[PDB]
C-alpha cells in the first residue's frame, strides 16, 4: 500500500 504524506517524518 502507498503511504501517508507524513509516514516519513520524525
Amino acid at each position, epitope marked *: 500500500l502507498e503511504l501517508d504524506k507524513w*509516514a516519513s*517524518l520524525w
Partner: antibody
Amino acid sequence: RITLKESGPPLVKPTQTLTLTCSFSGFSLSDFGVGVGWIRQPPGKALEWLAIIYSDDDKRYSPSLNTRLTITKDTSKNQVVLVMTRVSPVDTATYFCAHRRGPTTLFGVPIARGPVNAMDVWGQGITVTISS
Amino acid sequence: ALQLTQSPSSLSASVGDRITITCRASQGVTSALAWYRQKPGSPPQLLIYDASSLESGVPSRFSGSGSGTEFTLTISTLRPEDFATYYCQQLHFYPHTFGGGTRVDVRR
C-alpha cells in the same frame, strides 16, 4: 476555534452527480501541511474514509471509489469540494468533512509528525439520500 | 487492503468502571493511530492522536497506548457522556482505515 460545515443536496438521484462543499474558519488551506478530508457514514454503520486534499493540492482517494471521486480546494474562499459521480442507493449516508493538522513546524520546516495523526475537528455532517 | 480490527465490538459497563478497547492492525502503522468518541447524531470527537497523545480538551480519564500493530484506549472512570461508539483510525497508509466500532452501553 476551528469549525467546518458541510453543504449540498439532501436528495440526489442515481447516476447523477453529488457535489458537497466544506466551508471552514479557524485555519487556512495555505498553512503548511493542513488537510481537509471527507469521511462518510451509512445509516447505523461505521465511518468510511473517502478522500483528503492538502495545502499543496496533493490529493488522495479511497481506492474503491477512485473512479468517481474528485476533490478540490479554493484556498481563498476557505472551501473544499467533493464530487461523487454516478451515485447509487449504496452511497446514501451522512458525509463529514474534517480538518487535519500539519506537522509541528519550527521555522516553517517540520520538526514533529505527532499532531497529524488524527482528524482533530469535524463538521456536524450532512445527510445525503439517494433515491429514484 | 489494511484491515484494522476493534475488540470488544460491544461492551457493557456501569458508571465508574474502567474499560479498555483494542484496535489491531494487519501491518505496522507505527504510532499513527487515532481514537474517537461518537455520541448518536453527532460527529466523531478526537480523544487520542499519535497512539498515546491526549487531545487538548479531552478529560484525563482517557488514555491511549501501543505502537506498531497493537493499540488500546483506556478510559479509567466511566462517565455518563462516555456511553457511545468508539472508533480508531489508522493514518499511516492510504486509505486512512477506520475500525468497525465499539459500542458502549449501560450495564444492567
